[PDB]
């Protein structure tokens, strides 16, 4: 569902975009991995009371068969299904996916 997929942007630009102080906790985007070619990344804003704003990066791996997973426990047939699942369930992530990242 497009909006949350920022394609080939870098960890550093995703962090520029996510560290925007206006963004609520759980604001996210999906991008391609720089380090692991053929893999994706789920980038999500978070907050620590003492330290403030920070970004968690989760590698989305792709099986040869076609599926996607952050943890092999929960596999998905598409990235849109992975985003819809973690919007409702944190299930291992730092926080549930709330906002789509701006611009």
């Amino acid at each position: 569902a497009e909006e949350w997929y920022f394609g080939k942007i870098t960890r550093r630009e995703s962090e520029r975009l996510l560290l925007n102080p206006e963004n609520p906790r759980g604001t996210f985007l999906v991008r391609e991995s720089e380090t692991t070619k053929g893999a994706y990344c789920l980038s999500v804003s978070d907050f620590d009371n003492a330290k403030g704003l920070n970004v968690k990066h989760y590698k989305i791996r792709k099986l040869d068969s076609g599926g996607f997973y952050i943890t092999s426990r929960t596999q998905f047939s598409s990235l849109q299904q992975l985003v819809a699942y973690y919007s409702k369930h944190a299930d291992g992530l730092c926080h549930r996916l709330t906002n789509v990242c701006p611009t």
Binding site: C41, H57, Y58, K59, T71, G92, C94
Partner: peptide
Amino acid sequence: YLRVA
């Protein structure tokens, strides 16, 4: 990247 599960 973080460790999960």
